[PDB]
Amino acid sequence: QYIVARPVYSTNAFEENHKKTGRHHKTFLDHLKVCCSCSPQKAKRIVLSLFPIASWLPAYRLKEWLLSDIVSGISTGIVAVLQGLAFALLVDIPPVYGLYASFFPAIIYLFFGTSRHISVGPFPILSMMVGLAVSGAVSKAVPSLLDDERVRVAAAASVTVLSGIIQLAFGILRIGFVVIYLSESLISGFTTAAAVHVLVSQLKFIFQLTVPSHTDPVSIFKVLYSVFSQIEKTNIADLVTALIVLLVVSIVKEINQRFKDKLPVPIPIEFIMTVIAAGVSYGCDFKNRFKVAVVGDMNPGFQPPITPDVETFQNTVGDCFGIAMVAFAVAFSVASVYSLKYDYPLDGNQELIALGLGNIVCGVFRGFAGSTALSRSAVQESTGGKTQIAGLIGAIIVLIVVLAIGFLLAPLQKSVLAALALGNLKGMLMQFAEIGRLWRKDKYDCLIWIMTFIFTIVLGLGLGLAASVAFQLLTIVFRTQFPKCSTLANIGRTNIYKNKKDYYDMYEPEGVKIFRCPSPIYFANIGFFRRKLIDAVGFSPLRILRKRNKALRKIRKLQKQGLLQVTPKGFICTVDTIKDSDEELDNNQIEVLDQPINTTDLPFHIDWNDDLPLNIEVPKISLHSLILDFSAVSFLDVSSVRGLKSILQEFIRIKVDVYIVGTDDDFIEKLNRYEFFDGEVKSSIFFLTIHDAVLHILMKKD
Amino acid sequence: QYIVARPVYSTNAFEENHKKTGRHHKTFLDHLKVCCSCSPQKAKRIVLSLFPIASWLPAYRLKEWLLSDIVSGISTGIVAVLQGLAFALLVDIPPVYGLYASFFPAIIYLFFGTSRHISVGPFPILSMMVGLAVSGAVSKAVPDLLDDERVRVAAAASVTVLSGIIQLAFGILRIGFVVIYLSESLISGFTTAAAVHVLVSQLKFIFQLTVPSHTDPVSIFKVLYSVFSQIEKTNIADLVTALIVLLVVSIVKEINQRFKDKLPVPIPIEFIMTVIAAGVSYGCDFKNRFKVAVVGDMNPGFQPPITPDVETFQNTVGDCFGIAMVAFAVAFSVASVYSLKYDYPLDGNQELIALGLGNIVCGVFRGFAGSTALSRSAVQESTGGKTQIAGLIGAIIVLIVVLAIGFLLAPLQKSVLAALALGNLKGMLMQFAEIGRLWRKDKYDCLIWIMTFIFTIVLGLGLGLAASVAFQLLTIVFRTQFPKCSTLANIGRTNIYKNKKDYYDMYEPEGVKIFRCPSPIYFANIGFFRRKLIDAVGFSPLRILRKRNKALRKIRKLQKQGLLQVTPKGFICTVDTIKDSDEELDNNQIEVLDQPINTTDLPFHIDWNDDLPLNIEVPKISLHSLILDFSAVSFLDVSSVRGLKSILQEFIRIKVDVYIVGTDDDFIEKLNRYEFFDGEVKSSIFFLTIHDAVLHILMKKD
Ligand SMILES: CC(C)CCC[C@@H](C)[C@H]1CC[C@H]2[C@@H]3CC=C4C[C@@H](OC(=O)CCC(=O)O)CC[C@]4(C)[C@H]3CC[C@]12C
Ligand SMILES: CC(C)CCC[C@@H](C)[C@H]1CC[C@H]2[C@@H]3CC=C4C[C@@H](OC(=O)CCC(=O)O)CC[C@]4(C)[C@H]3CC[C@]12C
Ligand SMILES: CC(C)CCC[C@@H](C)[C@H]1CC[C@H]2[C@@H]3CC=C4C[C@@H](OC(=O)CCC(=O)O)CC[C@]4(C)[C@H]3CC[C@]12C
Ligand SMILES: CC(C)CCC[C@@H](C)[C@H]1CC[C@H]2[C@@H]3CC=C4C[C@@H](OC(=O)CCC(=O)O)CC[C@]4(C)[C@H]3CC[C@]12C
Ligand SMILES: CC(C)CCC[C@@H](C)[C@H]1CC[C@H]2[C@@H]3CC=C4C[C@@H](OC(=O)CCC(=O)O)CC[C@]4(C)[C@H]3CC[C@]12C
Ligand SMILES: CC(C)CCC[C@@H](C)[C@H]1CC[C@H]2[C@@H]3CC=C4C[C@@H](OC(=O)CCC(=O)O)CC[C@]4(C)[C@H]3CC[C@]12C
Ligand SMILES: CC(C)CCC[C@@H](C)[C@H]1CC[C@H]2[C@@H]3CC=C4C[C@@H](O)CC[C@]4(C)[C@H]3CC[C@]12C
Ligand SMILES: CC(C)CCC[C@@H](C)[C@H]1CC[C@H]2[C@@H]3CC=C4C[C@@H](O)CC[C@]4(C)[C@H]3CC[C@]12C
Ligand SMILES: CC(C)CCC[C@@H](C)[C@H]1CC[C@H]2[C@@H]3CC=C4C[C@@H](O)CC[C@]4(C)[C@H]3CC[C@]12C
Ligand SMILES: CC(C)CCC[C@@H](C)[C@H]1CC[C@H]2[C@@H]3CC=C4C[C@@H](O)CC[C@]4(C)[C@H]3CC[C@]12C
């Protein structure tokens, strides 16, 4: 049974009886000393962290990893070639830049990356964010089809170079923990909005229509209007072939997911349908019989590096910041699943550095933004990916496609790629069945999800992330704005104290009120806390103090006039009744009422609760003690400290004690720094538990 | 002493023994029913709240309030005329609009306002924010010195009409509680930055220099450069007269503040120095002897109303929102001091409605934004202001100045007003002695103050408020990002549990770890909480489960091969030593390790902690129970719930119990909605206090 027999402590007798260890908190001088303390072991650790390949490559097991890595690399290389060709169209650049952006960051990540399963390249969200950034940049540059494509390519290279520089700077600064400011609900809402954006954007390629590059403020609706204002000019053959490809891919993906145990090395539907479509377009000549747009004959080989444009750097700072943040968050979210699945450590700063270097190299070599895509990562993992050697094999396949087999993929329909991209939208769009779950569960994360979706949809991907982050930060204040403050009472004559309106046989101590605030008190909570405390107490301590001071001043004036003769016990009051001549105070003297009462000159100790001569109101209070249950109060910063000090001073000045209960050692240590304690609000008002506070009150009363 | 003898409770036996009251929580259907339930008493209350004059005017005491109100009204009318003339120059409009904006909102507030001491009009922060909004609006108008000010006046009228409409909408929506999202540190920083802005902006009038209206991004530095690039063209007479006026005003204000008891009806230094300067300028002709700019001959009378410009409405939406928010916050902050001083209720929604209506009327009648100024409010309160009759008398004085005495104030130097405005900068600039105090106290509110100052200075008043609000919201996440998680232990063989690294004679139960998170756990805290819990425990439950599952699979394979014969007690193990032929698991099958172990088919109960045959590692764990001290955990939303569920499942699946301790009834009630409880994580794992949890563990063990 719960049996305890201990003395009553007040967080000061406790410390006096039990000696503390006197731990030395770390200062700032020694923080820099240990950082600059260079040692060979720490240097080797830093070098190995910066070059994870030097650690994971010599530990390769070339007996059970080589074949699986090779197969997974071939599969992911085919998928990466197809996905780069598809996503190069979203930026509205020649397709070969998609291959470049699928090749270069993977090669850089093979050296500088810490994850072992993700595949680096383009994914639709980042691709369209880069495209929007390019459209914004080329619309602000100070003043043919070939020239427009070249300027778009240059703008994309500059934007992705700046994004890689930002990512590398973030990784160097060791601030790679910024991924925790994005809630799971915010991630879900943003991903669903981006999925809708992808579905809207791929329509102009499915229908084979010319759509101008729109601007960030309202992009999806403008694109939809532009697409549906020319719906008559659609290509029926292109539309039907896109539908067939999408239907076949979705059906095969469904059967592949359903039949997993019986199906090793899952069917490469992307490759199979792509080669089928290319063979159908060839021979049958799906470029003159119909007017289907096809992927042009890409130049076999790479391209010389270019210097990024400082004008674009200046123009698209915010867009590049958003691109870097989105890429890092997506990469971390994708890599964390496989890291937890296969039990290896993940380094956020190393991931940021690798992504930044890869993006920088890709932009220097005329590419665009690169990260890991969920579809490609899942393909690589399911095929049997064990290390980044699969990524190297995929890069080799991409290089082979770029160099040798370049005449192929030319009869490609330039919209089978769009249908393949839309085939990856099923998992993204299935997240729409989350509003109901969040509404049933939280009712606040549902608000976060809805607001994030609306903000992204009506503001573009670049600004929706910032707006959603701001609203998600505000939702914490929403949570801790109106805490369910309640009065506590004893249950069963034990040390159990719960809500006053919950149980039946409870009992409160005579003239004792226990108040609990089940939320941290900060700038947005001090006023509500004070109002709730005053309402629970039942009177205003400031009002009581002011009325008592007015009564004392009237009594002193009467004594000066001689109507009141002071005696050791009682007042003579040699007047039956006065005409009740009240006195008013001017504007600059009303402060004196708030001053504490000191009746040392009067030998009689005024009770302020029984009766006053000459019929003075002086409202009485039956509350002779107050206990604050600061057990759930995590922190106070400035305004809460000032409000608490004012409330405690007002309470103490009317001859009632205040006790703070439930705070640990750290809370009182922090409060000591705020100059909270003084000659009035001593440090002995803190008690361990409500029962100790109540027992101390009872002991001091009788 | 502290003597307790009660049975051990687990928040379920407690509820079974003590019957709850079964309170009926209010739903949403009845929330609308009580709002639409119209009653005569509620209608009368609503009408009286909407028209507070009908409540406070009949209760007038015309024996002790009339004379003081008249004197305070005369003084505040003189001060309001001077301050309106001064602040009309900051917007760069003819001075008479300052008188209009000092007259109209005061008249509207006399009817629709709830405060009794504040004086409505212009104040420099709002005046310059309106000026910046006007400069932005006139710089974006589509193209079609006397005509240059007309468009500025029209833009100011439109901007203030929109701001008043926004304020009225906010008051109608009953969202007048938005003043609690601005911390005291944020308010102090913004006020100091605005003071610096005022000091910089008034330089062009002190030196009598022509400065173009700059734009929001970097305004103060551009104005400073423009002023100091033409410092040679300054007027020495204007500078010296401004210096004398400022010095005399500051000295007289200092002596007035110091000598308060001996000095009733504080000296009207503004009025006396203004009339002295006007008489000197008129007598000595300070318009041709020197080149001092003077206030022009304002047209005696009012001006017809104008329709606000929809183009300006569309152009300056954000600026109008900022103006409305700043005006409401300033008015509430100024009025709260006097409301607390004189003990009368304040209505935020009524204040918002009154301010919105006043601003709407003033903008319609060609004025600019109106609120209460601290200087004017202090003058009115000190002079003897009791009700808004002082405001009415001030409006009457302003009307008299507008109509009858208009030929005066013409020889005014147009910079003595600037020096008078500078004289009010002492109180604002005294707030610079707060960085040190906040650094010594909080180290977070100091960051808020510094960031607010920097953001406002380098982004303008309109955008600095939003940036500082965002950073202040982020500071809460900064506070609750890395909580000081610690292990707890018993002290003195009682029910007191504190930090493990704090005391000497502590003792932990055998194989029991107590973990405490002294902060609410949300999206930005779940990962850190999991990492700290794993580090405190000393092992990874997922790793232990995976290794145990691998060992079980190897044992089952050996049993199938016949090397292991299952017996009721022990394994025969008819092999001296095997060649240690480990088996690797490919992808799409590694998840089976995470599945829970169910050794029902084996009669032997595997201990998983003593030893295993054929030398299998199976790392042992000494921990056999875990207690989470969720006493300071205020709330979980989605991600924290999911992470807690995953951690608890991982712990339970390795045959260890988890106990959550310290949560109240509301926390478990909220957690029940998240579908947290299921067949594995039951609802009986919640306990009242750490001592109950420990006693239950000891009872279960033996
Ligand atoms: C509170 C939540 C819902 C977010 C607030 C919504 C606003 C940020 C949105 C809603 C309506 C939007 C506007 C709707 C229409 C237009 C007209 C549009 O002008 C054009 O026709 C541009 C044509 C072109 O240049 O291609 C430019 C964007 C704009 C101002 C939009 C800007 C963004 C606005 C103000
Ligand atoms: C995330 C935390 C840790 C740091 C965030 C810092 C950024 C918000 C600041 C720091 C430096 C700033 C940049 C400093 C200098 C400039 C140059 C400036 O261009 C000009 O000089 C104007 C030229 C012209 O208008 O002709 C445009 C803004 C920019 C990129 C600034 C954008 C905002 C930046 C990136
Ligand atoms: C419990 C789990 C397995 C989910 C069960 C429900 C889903 C199968 C349903 C519920 C809501 C459905 C969504 C409701 C609305 C839409 C929008 C719509 O997509 C669009 O094309 C919208 C964009 C546009 O074309 O303008 C059609 C599919 C989708 C995502 C639906 C896909 C199927 C969802 C996710
Ligand atoms: C992280 C903290 C420090 C706040 C972030 C700082 C930025 C928001 C500031 C710092 C430097 C500023 C820039 C400094 C210089 C200029 C050049 C200026 O161009 C002119 O010369 C305008 C001349 C005119 O039109 O009158 C336009 C604003 C701009 C880009 C400023 C925009 C706002 C910036 C980027
Ligand atoms: C603070 C919460 C409670 C509400 C916030 C809502 C605002 C952010 C939204 C709602 C209405 C919106 C306005 C609705 C209509 C217009 C007109 C529209 O502009 C045009 O039509 C431009 C035409 C052109 O460019 O020729 C887009 C901006 C604006 C001012 C919108 C700006 C954003 C506003 C103010
Ligand atoms: C209550 C006690 C502890 C006050 C302590 C005194 C100082 C901490 C304060 C009081 C007056 C302050 C000064 C008042 C006025 C100004 C002018 C101000 O001018 C500007 O902004 C730059 C000049 C320009 O704008 O041309 C700069 C800050 C400064 C020196 C202030 C710096 C901080 C000071 C010295
Ligand atoms: C290139 C331009 C001129 C093409 C025409 C653009 C028109 C069709 C676009 C631009 C802005 C768009 C609006 C922007 C925002 C919203 C709010 C949303 O909740 C419903 C759709 C609605 C109301 C959009 C309707 C379509 C719209 C009016
Ligand atoms: C006209 C020219 C001079 C305008 C200025 C362009 C150059 C100097 C600016 C534009 C964008 C800037 C970058 C924007 C963002 C960051 C991230 C930060 O963590 C480090 C600095 C860094 C990487 C900046 C470096 C300087 C930068 C590249
Ligand atoms: C003549 C008018 C039109 C334009 C004047 C432009 C020049 C003088 C202005 C515009 C932008 C200004 C800069 C904006 C921001 C900063 C950062 C701050 O920490 C120091 C001052 C500094 C570096 C300013 C110096 C002056 C500046 C360069
Ligand atoms: C040229 C045309 C398109 C411009 C249209 C301008 C008008 C219709 C718009 C522009 C800005 C709008 C205001 C912006 C903000 C709010 C605050 C909200 O709480 C009530 C409505 C209100 C006050 C809006 C009313 C309508 C408004 C005045």
From Swiss-Prot, chain A:
CDD domains: STAS_SulP_like_sulfate_transporter. Residues 1-69, 114-117, 174, 256-319, 373-388, 468-678 are cytoplasmic. Residues 502-697 form the STAS domain. N-glycosylation is required for efficient cell surface expression, and protection from proteolytic degradation. It catalyses: hydrogencarbonate(in) + 2 chloride(out) = hydrogencarbonate(out) + 2 chloride(in). GO terms for molecular function: bicarbonate transmembrane transporter activity; chloride transmembrane transporter activity; chloride:bicarbonate antiporter activity; oxalate transmembrane transporter activity; secondary active sulfate transmembrane transporter activity; solute:inorganic anion antiporter activity; sulfate transmembrane transporter activity. Expressed in the colon. Expression is significantly decreased in adenomas (polyps) and adenocarcinomas of the colon. Belongs to the SLC26A/SulP transporter (TC 2.A.53) family. It is linked to Diarrhea 1, secretory chloride, congenital: A disease characterized by voluminous watery stools containing an excess of chloride. The children with this disease are often premature. This is Chloride anion exchanger. It comes from Homo sapiens. The lineage of its organism: Eukaryota, Metazoa, Chordata, Craniata, Vertebrata. The gene is SLC26A3.
